[PDB]
Amino acid sequence: GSHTPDESFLCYQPDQVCCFICRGAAPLPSEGECNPHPTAPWCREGAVEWVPYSTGQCRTTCIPYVE
């Protein structure tokens, strides 16, 4: 789409939650779905960044539910 900057997707799993801001890629699903979301206050609140994504470079982290 005329090239777009970084973007984050909040994925959902039967018992997990992932926050990722890619850089030329998309949200890789595994056992649930995902939604559109610029970034995440918790992503930075616990991780930091990323980069290694099959189709592109990303930046963010992953973690279980609230438990």
mmCIF file of C-alpha atoms in Angstrom:
data_model
loop_
_atom_site.group_PDB
_atom_site.id
_atom_site.type_symbol
_atom_site.label_atom_id
_atom_site.label_comp_id
_atom_site.label_asym_id
_atom_site.label_seq_id
_atom_site.Cartn_x
_atom_site.Cartn_y
_atom_site.Cartn_z
ATOM 1 C CA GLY A 1 0.000 0.000 0.000
ATOM 2 C CA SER A 2 2.429 2.657 -1.210
ATOM 3 C CA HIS A 3 4.782 1.465 1.536
ATOM 4 C CA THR A 4 3.756 2.009 5.159
ATOM 5 C CA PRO A 5 5.751 2.587 8.392
ATOM 6 C CA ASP A 6 5.776 0.242 11.397
ATOM 7 C CA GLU A 7 2.458 -1.135 12.674
ATOM 8 C CA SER A 8 1.381 -3.248 15.651
ATOM 9 C CA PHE A 9 -1.182 -6.014 15.939
ATOM 10 C CA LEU A 10 -2.592 -7.344 19.207
ATOM 11 C CA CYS A 11 -2.967 -11.103 18.816
ATOM 12 C CA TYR A 12 -5.163 -13.310 20.994
ATOM 13 C CA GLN A 13 -4.768 -16.955 22.019
ATOM 14 C CA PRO A 14 -6.790 -19.382 24.208
ATOM 15 C CA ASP A 15 -4.401 -18.408 27.028
ATOM 16 C CA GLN A 16 -1.936 -15.797 25.746
ATOM 17 C CA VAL A 17 -1.575 -12.256 24.396
ATOM 18 C CA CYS A 18 1.015 -10.855 21.979
ATOM 19 C CA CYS A 19 1.854 -7.241 21.155
ATOM 20 C CA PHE A 20 3.890 -6.647 17.991
ATOM 21 C CA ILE A 21 4.901 -3.624 15.900
ATOM 22 C CA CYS A 22 6.256 -5.044 12.661
ATOM 23 C CA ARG A 23 8.308 -3.260 9.971
ATOM 24 C CA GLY A 24 7.132 -4.749 6.658
ATOM 25 C CA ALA A 25 5.242 -7.822 7.862
ATOM 26 C CA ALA A 26 2.001 -9.018 9.502
ATOM 27 C CA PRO A 27 0.748 -10.853 12.630
ATOM 28 C CA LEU A 28 1.608 -14.566 12.462
ATOM 29 C CA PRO A 29 -1.343 -16.485 14.026
ATOM 30 C CA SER A 30 -1.054 -19.803 15.868
ATOM 31 C CA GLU A 31 -4.168 -20.633 17.971
ATOM 32 C CA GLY A 32 -6.406 -17.547 17.876
ATOM 33 C CA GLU A 33 -6.867 -14.212 16.108
ATOM 34 C CA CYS A 34 -5.590 -10.594 16.114
ATOM 35 C CA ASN A 35 -6.690 -6.962 15.788
ATOM 36 C CA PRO A 36 -5.384 -3.560 14.572
ATOM 37 C CA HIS A 37 -3.569 -1.452 17.174
ATOM 38 C CA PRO A 38 -0.817 1.175 16.593
ATOM 39 C CA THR A 39 1.353 0.077 19.540
ATOM 40 C CA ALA A 40 1.046 -1.162 23.155
ATOM 41 C CA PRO A 41 1.843 0.324 26.627
ATOM 42 C CA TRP A 42 2.491 -3.140 28.073
ATOM 43 C CA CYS A 43 4.729 -4.260 25.165
ATOM 44 C CA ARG A 44 7.305 -1.636 26.174
ATOM 45 C CA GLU A 45 6.224 -2.068 29.839
ATOM 46 C CA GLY A 46 7.922 -5.554 29.829
ATOM 47 C CA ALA A 47 9.991 -6.184 26.726
ATOM 48 C CA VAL A 48 11.562 -3.659 24.378
ATOM 49 C CA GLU A 49 11.867 -4.558 20.667
ATOM 50 C CA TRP A 50 12.213 -7.204 17.919
ATOM 51 C CA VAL A 51 13.371 -7.314 14.237
ATOM 52 C CA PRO A 52 13.617 -10.980 13.059
ATOM 53 C CA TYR A 53 10.405 -11.733 11.133
ATOM 54 C CA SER A 54 10.279 -14.151 8.154
ATOM 55 C CA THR A 55 8.632 -11.758 5.613
ATOM 56 C CA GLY A 56 10.013 -8.540 7.278
ATOM 57 C CA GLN A 57 11.566 -6.793 10.345
ATOM 58 C CA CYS A 58 9.407 -6.256 13.424
ATOM 59 C CA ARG A 59 9.667 -4.781 16.994
ATOM 60 C CA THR A 60 7.798 -5.812 20.195
ATOM 61 C CA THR A 61 7.251 -8.784 22.580
ATOM 62 C CA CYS A 62 4.919 -11.668 23.685
ATOM 63 C CA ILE A 63 3.482 -12.940 26.974
ATOM 64 C CA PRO A 64 0.674 -15.026 28.549
ATOM 65 C CA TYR A 65 -2.616 -13.614 29.830
ATOM 66 C CA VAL A 66 -2.949 -11.641 33.075
ATOM 67 C CA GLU A 67 -2.122 -14.663 35.236
#
